[PDB]
Design a protein. Structure first.
Ligand SMILES: Nc1ncnc2c1ncn2[C@@H]1O[C@H](COP(=O)(O)O)[C@@H](O)[C@H]1O
Ligand SMILES: Nc1ncnc2c1ncn2[C@@H]1O[C@H](COP(=O)(O)O)[C@@H](O)[C@H]1O
Ligand SMILES: Nc1ncnc2c1ncn2[C@@H]1O[C@H](COP(=O)(O)O)[C@@H](O)[C@H]1O
Ligand SMILES: Nc1ncnc2c1ncn2[C@@H]1O[C@H](COP(=O)(O)O)[C@@H](O)[C@H]1O
Ligand SMILES: Nc1ncnc2c1ncn2[C@@H]1O[C@H](COP(=O)(O)O)[C@@H](O)[C@H]1O
Lengths: 150, 148, 150, 150, 148
C-alpha cells in the first residue's frame, strides 16, 4: 500500500486533451496522486526514461516523439498501483487493448499510444526517482483510505 | 480503410446514436458519411443477403425495416477490426462491459448496432447505402497525434 | 405543438470530435432525430445559409470558414425544439454562454462557436428547405412520446 | 490575449477525487495547460496567497484549511481564460452557484468550495509568480489552436 | 435539513434514476431513504394536496399513479433549496442545461422529478411516503470534506 507507480501522458495525450480523463480514472479507481507536473522532455530526459528500450529498433523514433512536446508526469500510490495502473491503461499496442482502458478507448497506433505506466515496481522506483526530486512528492492521507483498503 | 456502421432501430429508439458516435470520435476515427432512414423490406433483405439461410433471417429483416437506422462510414487504419471491437461481440451475452453491446444490450435480436465483418463486406455495405455524392473527403487536423 | 429545427455542427465542431456529444444532448433532452448528413458546404451554400447577413464585416470570413471543411447537419422535431434547441447550444458569443450549454462547455471564440441552431420557426423552415431534401426526412414515432409529452 | 489564469484545486477538492474532472473541463473548453503542481502549502504560503483577505474573520480558518493537505496548482492559457475560468468554476459561494459549474455540481459550503481561480488578469500574474517559477511554465503550441481561435 | 426527492413515472421509464441519484451524491448530500412503489390514486391526491385547485390536477394525479416512482430522502445543509436548484425550474421550458429538467425534460406534465418546496413541505412529504424506520442514520466519512 506504500507501492507507487509512475504514469505519463505522452505528447499525443496532452495534445489531444486527455489529461483530465486519465487522472479521473486513477482517482476513481481509489489511488492517491502524490506528484504531478508538466514539462517538455529534453532528448536526454527521453533516452534515460526509455533505457529499457535503448536496444530496440524503434528507440530513436520513440525518443524523438517523447521529446517533441509537453508530457505530464504523475506518481500514484496504493496497494497494487503498478499492476492496476497497467490494467487501467490497457495493452501497450492499442490494437490489443479492450474498450474500457485508456488505449482501448482512445488510441490506435503503438507510436501514439497516449500514456505510459511503469512495467514493474522497480522500474517504478527508477522512473519516479528519475523525474521527481524527493522534495517533489507530497505525503498525505486520503480521508477515504478505509473505504478503499482492508 | 473504411467500415460501415449502423445503429439499428432499437438503438435509434433508445437514444444511443450520440453515444456510439462519441466512442468512434474519441477513438481517433474519422466520420465520412452519415444519414438516417427507415429501410424498406427490400433494403433490409438486401442488406442482410449473407444470412438468408439462417432461421432468424425474416425476424431480422422485419426488425431492421420497422424504423430508422442511422448509417455511417468511418475511415481509419484498422477501422474494420477496431470498429467491431468497439461494438462488442455480436451476441450481447458474450460482450464485455466497455463495448457498445456490453454497456447497452441484452438480446442478439436487439443488439443495438451493426458493423461490417470484413473490408469486402465494408465496401459492399457502403456502396449498398451511400452514393459517392454523399461520402465526404476531408483531412482531420489531428492526424499526426493519432497516427505515427 | 410542432415543430422542427435545424442544427449544424460546424467545421470546428466536426474537427474537435464533438458530433456525438451534441447529438447525445438532443437525445437526452427527448427530441427526435429526423434528418442527418455530413457535407463540405460549397462557398455558395455557405452564402445562401448566411444570406440574412451578407452585409456584415465578418461575413466573408464566416463564408470562407463555414465551407473550409465538413459540417454535420441535423433536423430535430418536438414541442418547442426551436427555442429549447437554442438554449442547449447557449448564447451565440461563447463569452456569454453558461456552462452546461454546448458553447458554454466547448467554445471560446464567436467564429469558432462549434454549432449553429435556427433562431426561430420561420428560420428553421428556411434552413431545413435549404439543406435537406424533404423526401429524405424520416417520419417515425418514438416509442417514448407519452413519456416525454402530456 | 493570450492571458493566463491560475486555478487551484483546494484540499477538499483533492480529497474528493475531483482533480481529473476539473482539468477535463478546462481541456474540453479549449484552454491550454502550461504549469501543473501538487504540494501541501505552508501556513506561510497560504497567507501569501490570500494576502488581500487577512482582515476578514474567516481568514485564520481559511489559512489553516488551505494548508491542511495537498492542493493542485495549475496555469491555463487562452483568450479570456481568467473571465472564463471563473465562469467554469461558478460563484465563489456554492449556494449562489449554478449546476453545470464546478461549485454548482460539487460543493455545498463556501468554506469547502473545491477550487480557486484568479479573480482578474492582474491577480493571475500575482498568483502565477507566487506559486510557479517562470521555468516551471511550459511553452508550447496546441495542434488545435486554429479550430479554437478564429 | 432533509428534503424529499421523487423520480416520477416518466423519470423511471426513461432510466434517469441513477443519473438523478448520482447528481445528488456528487454534490455532497447524504442519501437517507429510498423505495419504489406505484402510487395509488389516493396517495397521489394526498401528496398533491395543495394543488387540488388546478385544472391540471386530475391529469397529474392519473399520471403520478400510472407507474412506479422512486422516492428518496436526502440530508445536508441547505438541501431543500439546493435540491431544487439541482432539479431546475418546475417548467422545463424555463430550465437551464446543467439541471435535471434542463438536460432531460421538455413538458411540465412530464417534468421527470419532484423536490420539496420548503422545509415544512419536506417534513410533510417525508412522513407521508416513509415510515420513520425506513430512514437510515449514518455518518459519511466525508462530512469534513464537505462542511467546515
Ligand atoms: N514504431 C514502433 N514499433 C513497434 N513498437 C513501438 C513503436 N513505437 C513504440 N513502440 C512501443 O513503445 C513501448 C514503450 O513503452 P510505453 O512508454 O509504455 O509506450 C514499447 O514497449 C514498444 O513496443
Ligand atoms: N434471433 C436470433 N438468433 C440467433 N442469432 C441472431 C438472431 N438475430 C440476429 N442474430 C445474429 O445477427 C447477426 C448479424 O449481424 P449484425 O448485422 O451485426 O446483427 C448474426 O451474427 C447472427 O448470429
Ligand atoms: N468575426 C466575427 N465577429 C462577430 N461575430 C461573428 C464573427 N463570426 C461569426 N459571428 C457570429 O456568427 C453568428 C451566426 O450564427 P450561427 O449560424 O449560429 O453561426 C452571428 O450572429 C455573428 O454574430
Ligand atoms: N466562513 C466564510 N464565510 C464567508 N465567506 C468565506 C468563508 N470562508 C471562505 N470564504 C470565501 O472565500 C473566498 C476566497 O476566494 P477563493 O480563493 O476564490 O475561495 C472569499 O471571497 C470568501 O467569500
Ligand atoms: N398545463 C399543465 N399541465 C400539466 N401540469 C402543469 C400544467 N401547468 C403547470 N403544471 C405543473 O405540474 C407541476 C407538478 O408539480 P412537481 O411536483 O413540481 O412536478 C405543478 O407544479 C404545476 O405547475
Amino acid at each position: 500500500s506504500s507501492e507507487r507507480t509512475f504514469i505519463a501522458v505522452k505528447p499525443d495525450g496532452v495534445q489531444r486533451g486527455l489529461v483530465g480523463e486519465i487522472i479521473a480514472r486513477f482517482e476513481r479507481k481509489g489511488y492517491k496522486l502524490v506528484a504531478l507536473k508538466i514539462l517538455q522532455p529534453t532528448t536526454e530526459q527521453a533516452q534515460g526514461h526509455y533505457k529499457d528500450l535503448c536496444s530496440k529498433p524503434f528507440f530513436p523514433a520513440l525518443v524523438k516523439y517523447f521529446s517533441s512536446g509537453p508530457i505530464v508526469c504523475m506518481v500514484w500510490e496504493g496497494k497494487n498501483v503498478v499492476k492496476s495502473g497497467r490494467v487501467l491503461l490497457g495493452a501497450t499496442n492499442p490494437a490489443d487493448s479492450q474498450p474500457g482502458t485508456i488505449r482501448g478507448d482512445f488510441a490506435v497506433d503503438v507510436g501514439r499510444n497516449v500514456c505510459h505506466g511503469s512495467d514493474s515496481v522497480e522500474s517504478a522506483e527508477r522512473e519516479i526517482a528519475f523525474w521527481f526530486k524527493a522534495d517533489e512528492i507530497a505525503s498525505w492521507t486520503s480521508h477515504s483510505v478505509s473505504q478503499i483498503y482492508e
